[PDB]
Design a protein around this ligand. Structure first.
Ligand SMILES: *[C@@H]1O[C@H](CO)[C@@H](O[C@@H]2O[C@H](CO)[C@@H](O[C@@H]3O[C@H](CO[C@H]4O[C@H](CO[C@H]5O[C@H](CO)[C@@H](O)[C@H](O)[C@@H]5O[C@H]5O[C@H](CO)[C@@H](O)[C@H](O)[C@@H]5O)[C@@H](O)[C@H](O[C@H]5O[C@H](CO)[C@@H](O)[C@H](O)[C@@H]5O[C@H]5O[C@H](CO)[C@@H](O)[C@H](O)[C@@H]5O)[C@@H]4O)[C@@H](O)[C@H](O[C@H]4O[C@H](CO)[C@@H](O)[C@H](O)[C@@H]4O[C@H]4O[C@H](CO)[C@@H](O)[C@H](O)[C@@H]4O)[C@@H]3O)[C@H](O)[C@H]2NC(C)=O)[C@H](O)[C@H]1NC(C)=O
Ligand SMILES: CC(C)[C@H](C)[C@@H](O)[C@H](O)[C@@H](C)[C@H]1CC[C@H]2[C@@H]3CC[C@@H]4C[C@H](O)[C@H](O)C[C@]4(C)[C@H]3CC[C@]12C
Ligand SMILES: *[C@@H]1O[C@H](CO)[C@@H](O[C@@H]2O[C@H](CO)[C@@H](O)[C@H](O)[C@H]2NC(C)=O)[C@H](O)[C@H]1NC(C)=O
Ligand SMILES: *[C@@H]1O[C@H](CO)[C@@H](O[C@@H]2O[C@H](CO)[C@@H](O)[C@H](O)[C@H]2NC(C)=O)[C@H](O)[C@H]1NC(C)=O
Ligand SMILES: *[C@@H]1O[C@H](CO)[C@@H](O[C@@H]2O[C@H](CO)[C@@H](O)[C@H](O)[C@H]2NC(C)=O)[C@H](O)[C@H]1NC(C)=O
Ligand SMILES: *[C@@H]1O[C@H](CO)[C@@H](O[C@@H]2O[C@H](CO)[C@@H](O)[C@H](O)[C@H]2NC(C)=O)[C@H](O)[C@H]1NC(C)=O
Ligand SMILES: *[C@@H]1O[C@H](CO)[C@@H](O[C@@H]2O[C@H](CO)[C@@H](O)[C@H](O)[C@H]2NC(C)=O)[C@H](O)[C@H]1NC(C)=O
Ligand SMILES: *[C@@H]1O[C@H](CO)[C@@H](O[C@@H]2O[C@H](CO)[C@@H](O)[C@H](O)[C@H]2NC(C)=O)[C@H](O)[C@H]1NC(C)=O
Ligand SMILES: *[C@@H]1O[C@H](CO)[C@@H](O)[C@H](O)[C@H]1NC(C)=O
Ligand SMILES: *[C@@H]1O[C@H](CO)[C@@H](O)[C@H](O)[C@H]1NC(C)=O
Ligand SMILES: *[C@@H]1O[C@H](CO)[C@@H](O)[C@H](O)[C@H]1NC(C)=O
Ligand SMILES: *[C@@H]1O[C@H](CO)[C@@H](O)[C@H](O)[C@H]1NC(C)=O
Length: 721
C-alpha cells in the first residue's frame, strides 16, 4: 500500500466533485495540498476551502504511515463507511466546515491517534450523545473543539474529567446537550485555560465543586443556557486568579451583581452578564478592574448612577453595553473619563436630558466609533459637539424627543456610516454635500420626522448605501434620478410624503434593490418596466443581519400601505406597540427579527408598495417575473389595461393589491397557481368574467371583488346563471 496509491484511492473513492480543479495534477510530493517530507513520505494534506464534495472515511487516509496533519476544513465532506482498520499518527486534525454526521469518527480519533495535539470537529452535523473521552494513553492532546454540532441529551458525569491532564482548550458550544450542571465533574482540571458550554440547555442552581480546581482558567463561557439562581459570590471567584473572560449571559440569573465577583479584577478583561434578570447596580468593588475592556450588562433590570460612581473609574473601558435596563436620569458626564471608549450602548433606558457629547472634547482625539441611545427620553437638539468625534461610524438617536435641525457637522463626519435618528421631531433638510465631504453612508434612516425639502441628487455619491428610510416626513419635490448609481442599495422607503414627478427609470440599475416603498405620495407618470429588469440577478448584500420590525396593517386596502418596516436596533417592542403610527390601522401585528435573505443568488425584488399615488398607464408585463416578490401593492392609482397573465409567476407572493384603478378584462387563471396568496384585493375596477377557481381565490371575502364590471363565480353568484 504505497502512499501515492492511497491518496489516489482517496480522490476517487471519497471525492465526488472538484469544481475548483484544485485537486488536479494528482510523485506524491508534487500533488496540490500534500506537504511531503525529505525521505519521500507524506506527512500532511492541506485541502482547506477547496469546495470539495464527497464521503469521508478517515481510515482510508490514516493508512498513510507518516501522516500527521490533515486539513479538510471548508469543504462539503459527508460521513463515510467504516471501511478498514488502520493505525493513526495524526497530530493535528481539522474538519471544521463539512457535513459530517457520524460521530464514530470522534471515537476513532479519541481511541487511536495517541499523538493527537489538536482536533477541530466544529461546524458539522455530528449527532448523538457524548460518550467517550480521549484515550488515557494519549499524553499530548491539548485543544479539542466539538462546537457547533447537534450533540444531544445528558453529558456524562466524568466526560470532562476523563480527558488527559494536558487539556488546555475545550469548546462544547453550539449543541443541545442537557443536564444539571452541578453533577458534572471536571476532575483535577489541571492546565485547563479555555472552557465553553455556551448555547446549550444546561440547568442547575449550583456550579460543580470540581470547577474550582481549574486554577488556570482564562476563559469561562456559559452563555445561552438555563442556569438559575443567584450568581456565586463569597470566596468562589478567588479560585480563578487567571480568569480574563467570563460569560454568564442569557441564563436565568436573578438578584444583584455580587460584589465578590470583583475578585477577578486583577485579570478580568471581558465580562458579559447580559440577558438575565439582574437588579440593583454594578457594585462599587469593581473600581479595581483596571484591566476590564468589554463590559456588557444589557437586557437586565439594573438602575442607579453606577455609570458615574463606578464605570467612569474604569480607565481601560473600550466597549460598554448597557441597553435595555432601567437607568434613569441624565447620562453622566463623568463617563468621558473613559479615555479609550470606542462603543457606548445605552439604548432602551429611562435616560433624560440632552445628548451626551463630552467624549469628543477630550484633551486627546476621541476614539468613539459607535454611540447608541435609542428608545430614551432625550430632548433638545443634536449637539454640534459630536462633529469633533472624527472616528464616529454609527449614530443611533432614534425614538427620543429630539427636535430642531440636524447640524451640518453631522453630515461632514469623515467616517460616519450609519445615521439612524428616526422617530423624532427633527426638522430641516438634507444637505447637497452628503457623502462627498462627509462619510459614504451605509444607512440613512430618518423616517417619522418633520424633515422638509427634496432629496438631493448628491445622494448619488453614497455608493455604499444599503438602506434609506425617509417615510412619513414632509418631503417634497421629485425622486432624484441619481439613485440609480446606488448598486448596493437594498431598501428604499419614501412613503407618506408629498413626492411629485415620475418614478425614475434609473431605479432599474439598483442591482441589489429588494424593498421599494413609495406609498401615499403624489407621483404620476407610467409604471417603469425597468423595476423588474434585475429579476433573477439580485445578489444579497451587507444589509443582511440587521434588526428590523414589521408592523402589518391588517385592515385591508382602507389602511394606507401594506405595512411598516422599521430599523429596530435598541428599541423595545412595547415602545412600538404604543407608537400612534401603529394605531393608524385598527388591526395590527408586530413581526420582528433580523434581516435575512431567502436566496443566495439570482434573486428578485421582495417588497413593492406603490399604492396611493396617481400613476397611469398599463402594468408592465415584466413585473410578473419576480419570483421572490412577496408583496405587490399597486392599489389606489389610475392604472389601466389588464392584469398580465405573467402574474402567475409571482410564486412567493402573499399579498396582491390592485384595487381602486381602471384595470379592465379578466382575472388571470394562473392566480390560482399561487400557493401562498393569502391577501388579494381587486375591488373597485372595471374587471369582468369568472373568478379563477384554483388556489385560494374562491375563499376571499366578498369585499375583495366588489364594485367591478361583471365579475361572476364563487364567492360571487355563479357565472352560468
Ligand atoms: C461565548 O460564546 C458565545 C457563543 O456561544 C459567543 O457569542 C458569539 O459572539 C460573537 C462575537 O463576534 C457573535 O458574532 C457576532 O454577532 C453579531 C450579531 O450579534 C447579535 O446577534 C447574534 C445572533 O442572535 C440570534 O441568535 C441568537 C442565538 O443564536 C438568538 O438568541 C437571537 O434571538 C438571534 O436570533 C434571531 O436571529 C436568528 C438569525 O436570523 C434567527 O434564527 C432567530 O430566529 C432570530 O430571528 C447574537 O449572538 C449576539 O449576541 C451577542 O451580543 C449581545 C449584545 O451585545 C449579547 O447579549 C450576547 O451575549 C452576545 O455577546 C457577544 O457580542 C457582544 C457584542 O455584540 C460582546 O459584548 C460579548 O462579549 C459577546 O461576544 C447579538 O444579539 C454580528 O454583528 C457579527 O457579525 C460580524 O462578524 C462576522 C464574522 O464573525 C461577519 O461575517 C459579519 O459580517 C459581521 O462583521 C462586521 O464586523 C466585523 C468586525 O467585527 C467587520 O470585519 C465586518 O466588516 C462587519 O462590520 C458576529 O457574527 C455571535 O453572534 C455570538 N453568538 C451567540 C450565540 O451569542 C461569545 O462571544 C462568547 N463570549 C466570550 C466572552 O468569549
Ligand atoms: C428587507 C428584508 C431582507 C426583510 C428584513 C426580510 O428578511 C423579512 O423576512 C420579510 C420579507 C418578512 C418579515 C415579515 C413578513 C410579513 C408578515 C406579515 C404578512 C403576512 C402575510 O401572510 C403575507 O406573508 C404578507 C406579510 C406582509 C409578510 C411579508 C414578508 C415579511 C415582510
Ligand atoms: C454537498 O454535498 C451534498 C451531498 O452530500 C449535496 O446535497 C445534495 O445536492 C443535490 C444537488 O446537487 C440535491 O439534489 C440533493 O438532494 C442533496 N442531498 C442532500 C442529502 O442534501 C449538496 O448540494 C452539496 N453542497 C454543495 C456542493 O454546496
Ligand atoms: C424597567 O423598565 C421596564 C421596561 O420599560 C418596565 O417594564 C414594563 O413595565 C410596564 C408597566 O406598566 C409594562 O406595561 C410593560 O409591559 C413592561 N415591559 C416589559 C418589557 O416588561 C419595568 O416596569 C421597569 N421597572 C421599574 C422598577 O420601573
Ligand atoms: C403620515 O405621517 C403623518 C405625520 O404627521 C401622520 O399624521 C398624523 O396623523 C395622526 C392620525 O391619528 C394624528 O394623530 C397625528 O397628530 C398626525 N401627526 C401630525 C404631526 O400631523 C399621518 O397619519 C401619516 N399617514 C400615514 C398614512 O401613515
Ligand atoms: C397630494 O395628494 C394628497 C392626497 O390626495 C392631496 O391632499 C388631498 O387633496 C384633496 C383634494 O380634494 C383633499 O380633499 C384632501 O383632504 C387632501 N388630503 C388628503 C389626506 O387626501 C394633496 O393636495 C396633494 N399634493 C400635491 C402637492 O399635489
Ligand atoms: C444568475 O446570475 C448569473 C450571474 O449574473 C447569470 O450568469 C452570468 O451572468 C453574467 C452577467 O451577470 C454573464 O456575463 C454570464 O455570461 C452569465 N453566465 C451564464 C448565463 O452562464 C445567470 O444567467 C443567472 N441565472 C438565471 C437568471 O437563471
Ligand atoms: C363600492 O362603492 C360604493 C360606492 O362608492 C362604496 O360605498 C361608499 O362607501 C363610502 C365609505 O364608506 C361612503 O362614504 C359612501 O357614501 C358610500 N357610497 C354609497 C353610494 O353608499 C363601497 O364601500 C364600495 N365597496 C368596496 C368594497 O370598496
Ligand atoms: C476505503 O477503502 C475501502 C477498501 O477498498 C473501500 O471499501 C471504501 O469504500 C473506502 N472508503 C472511502 C470513503 O472511500
Ligand atoms: C499539566 O499539568 C501538570 C500538573 O501541573 C503538569 O505536570 C504537566 O506538565 C501539564 N501539562 C502541560 C502540557 O502543560
Ligand atoms: C433541546 O433540548 C431541550 C431540553 O431537552 C428540548 O426541550 C428542546 O426541544 C431541544 N431542542 C431541539 C431542537 O431538539
Ligand atoms: C413630537 O412631539 C410630540 C409633542 O407632543 C410628541 O408627542 C411626539 O411623540 C414627538 N414625535 C416623535 C416621533 O417622537
Amino acid at each position: 500500500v504505497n502512499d501515492t496509491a492511497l491518496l489516489t484511492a482517496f480522490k476517487q473513492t471519497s471525492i465526488k466533485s472538484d469544481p475548483t480543479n484544485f485537486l488536479g495534477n494528482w510523485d506524491p510530493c508534487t500533488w496540490r495540498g500534500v506537504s511531503c517530507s525529505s525521505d519521500g513520505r507524506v506527512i500532511g494534506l492541506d485541502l482547506r476551502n477547496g469546495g470539495l464534495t464527497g464521503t469521508l472515511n478517515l481510515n482510508n487516509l490514516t493508512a498513510l504511515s507518516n501522516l500527521r496533519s490533515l486539513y479538510l476544513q471548508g469543504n462539503n465532506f459527508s460521513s463515510g463507511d467504516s471501511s478498514s482498520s488502520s493505525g493513526c499518527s495524526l497530530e493535528v486534525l481539522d474538519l471544521s466546515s463539512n457535513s459530517l454526521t457520524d460521530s464514530s469518527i470522534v471515537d476513532y480519533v479519541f481511541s487511536t491517534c495517541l499523538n493527537l495535539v489538536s482536533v477541530n470537529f466544529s461546524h458539522n452535523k455530528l449527532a448523538g450523545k457524548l460518550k467517550s473521552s480521549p484515550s488515557a494513553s494519549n499524553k499530548r492532546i491539548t485543544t479539542v473543539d466539538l462546537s457547533n454540532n447537534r450533540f444531544s441529551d445528558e453529558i456524562p458525569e466524568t466526560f470532562i474529567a476523563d480527558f488527559p491532564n494536558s487539556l488546555k482548550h475545550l469548546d462544547l458550544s453550539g449543541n443541545n446537550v442537557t443536564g444539571d450542571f452541578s453533577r458534572l465533574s471536571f476532575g483535577l482540571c489541571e492546565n485547563l485555560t479555555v472552557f465553553s458550554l455556551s448555547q446549550n440547555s444546561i440547568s442547575g442552581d449550583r456550579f460543580p465543586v470540581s470547577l474550582s480546581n481549574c486554577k488556570l482558567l482564562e476563559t469561562l463561557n456559559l452563555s445561552r443556557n438555563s442556569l438559575i439562581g443567584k450568581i456565586p459570590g463569597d470566596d468562589y471567584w478567588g479560585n480563578f486568579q487567571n480568569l480574563r473572560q467570563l460569560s454568564l449571559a442569557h441564563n436565568l440569573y436573578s438578584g444583584e451583581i455580587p460584589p465578590e465577583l470583583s475578585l477577578l479584577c486583577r485579570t478580568l478583561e471581558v465580562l458579559d452578564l447580559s440577558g438575565n434578570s439582574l437588579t440593583g447596580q454594578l457594585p462599587q468593588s469593581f473600581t479595581s478592574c483596571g484591566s476590564l475592556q468589554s463590559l456588557n450588562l444589557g437586557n437586565n433590570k439594573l438602575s442607579g448612577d453606577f455609570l458615574s460612581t463606578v464605570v467612569s473609574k474604569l480607565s481601560r473601558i473600550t466597549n460598554l453595553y448597557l441597553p435595555f435596563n432601567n437607568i434613569s436620569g441624565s447620562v453622566p458626564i463623568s463617563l468621558t473619563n473613559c479615555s479609550n471608549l470606542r462603543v457606548l450602548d445605552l439604548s432602551s433606558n429611562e435616560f433624560t436630558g440632552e445628548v451626551p457629547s463630552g467624549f469628543c472634547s477630550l484633551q486627546s482625539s476621541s476614539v468613539l466609533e459607535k454611540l447608541l441611545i435609542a428608545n430614551n427620553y432625550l430632548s433638545g437638539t443634536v449637539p454640534v459637539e459630536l462633529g469633533k468625534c472624527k472616528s464616529l461610524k454609527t449614530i443611533d438617536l432614534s425614538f427620543n424627543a429630539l427636535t430642531g435641525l440636524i447640524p451640518k457637522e453631522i453630515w461632514t463626519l469623515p467616517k460616519l456610516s450609519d445615521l439612524v435618528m428616526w422617530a423624532n421631531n427633527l426638522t430641516g433638510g438634507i444637505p447637497e454635500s452628503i457623502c462627498v465631504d462627509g462619510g459614504n453612508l451605509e444607512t440613512l434612516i430618518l423616517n417619522n420626522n418633520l424633515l422638509t425639502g427634496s432629496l438631493p441628487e448628491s445622494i448619488s455619491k453614497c455608493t455604499n448605501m444599503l438602506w434609506i428610510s425617509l417615510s412619513s416626513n414632509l418631503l417634497t419635490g421629485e425622486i432624484p434620478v441619481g439613485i440609480g448609481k446606488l448598486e448596493k442599495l437594498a431598501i428604499l422607503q419614501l412613503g407618506n410624503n408629498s413626492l411629485t414627478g415620475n418614478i425614475p427609470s434609473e431605479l432599474g440599475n439598483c442591482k441589489n434593490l429588494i424593498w421599494l416603498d413609495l406609498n401615499s405620495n403624489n407621483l404620476t407618470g407610467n409604471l417603469p418596466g425597468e423595476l423588474a429588469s434585475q429579476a433573477g440577478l439580485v445578489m444579497p448584500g451587507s444589509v443582511s443581519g440587521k434588526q428590523f420590525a414589521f408592523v402589518r396593517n391588517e385592515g385591508g386596502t382602507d389602511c394606507r400601505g401594506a405595512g411598516g418596516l422599521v430599523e429596530f436596533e435598541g428599541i423595545r417592542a412595547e415602545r412600538l406597540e404604543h407608537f400612534p403610527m401603529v394605531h393608524s390601522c385598527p388591526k395590527t401585528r408586530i413581526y420582528s427579527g433580523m434581516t435575512m435573505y431567502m436566496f443566495s443568488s439570482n434573486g428578485s425584488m421582495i417588497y413593492l408598495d406603490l399604492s396611493y399615488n396617481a400613476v397611469s398607464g398599463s402594468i408592465p408585463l415584466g413585473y410578473g417575473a419576480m419570483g421572490y416578490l412577496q408583496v405587490l401593492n399597486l392599489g389606489h392609482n389610475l392604472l389601466t389595461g389588464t392584469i398580465p397573465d405573467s402574474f402567475g409567476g409571482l410564486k412567493a407572493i402573499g399579498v396582491l393589491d390592485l384595487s381602486h384603478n381602471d384595470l379592465q378584462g379578466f382575472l388571470p387563471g394562473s392566480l390560482g397557481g399561487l400557493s401562498f396568496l393569502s391577501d388579494l384585493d381587486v375591488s373597485n375596477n372595471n374587471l369582468t368574467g369568472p373568478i379563477p377557481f384554483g388556489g385560494q381565490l374562491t375563499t376571499f371575502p366578498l369585499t375583495r371583488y366588489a364594485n367591478n364590471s361583471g365579475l361572476c363565480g364563487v364567492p360571487l353568484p355563479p357565472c352560468s346563471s
